[PDB]
């Protein structure tokens, strides 16, 4: 019910462990499983939002606080030379998982074009 | 002034266009000039907001609403298989123009790595 039917809403029901390195009222950041920089994480809101194109306007607040946390987060690991952040919407995008999420990437140069 | 110092603050304040796509009273959207996909925009905030690492919490709705814009602006142009947002900060993170910008790239399968 809360938190929604996939791979995130087992994480955000702590049904299944992640770790955890932010949780507020509304969100919650964890180490991603599959790095792709030496700091991987994502944060997701514990609000089910399939994907950022069925996000509505009343969500903004809460898809801004996403970033914010990620920057927090960021600065607690070390991030002092920067970071990305991502997010992927649909088959193009690269989602996999159909709760939004944000991507922070960090610890290495970022290339370009971002895939 | 207002729109800040860098290039973007030059096309927030219409000294040099920018082909615009979406404008509203909080933010702009415009095409990339060295896109890295078939679609290839940015949204940004009139507000001066250097980076993403600077922003306060009282910026949650504005950020979220670059991504919102983002949406919309995508959903226009006709991305129905999706796209991928960046937000690229400091150094690491490949940002140039330290002013706050949100890509949104798709019209083709975005990689991963993102860079
Ligand atoms: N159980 C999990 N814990 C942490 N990250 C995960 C888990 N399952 C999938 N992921 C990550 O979710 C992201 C979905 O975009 C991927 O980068 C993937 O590696
Ligand atoms: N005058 C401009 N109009 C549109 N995009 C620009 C301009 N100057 C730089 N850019 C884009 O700004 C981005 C900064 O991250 C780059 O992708 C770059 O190509
Ligand atoms: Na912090
Ligand atoms: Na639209």
Redesign the pocket.
Known sequence: RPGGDT?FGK?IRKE?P?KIIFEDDQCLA?????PQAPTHF?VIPKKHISQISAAEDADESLLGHLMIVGKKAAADLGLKKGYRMVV?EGSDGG???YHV?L?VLGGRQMNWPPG
Do not use: K, M, T
């Open positions: 791979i994480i299944i992640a964890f180490h991603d499983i599959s994502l992927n989602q996999s998982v999420h991507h």
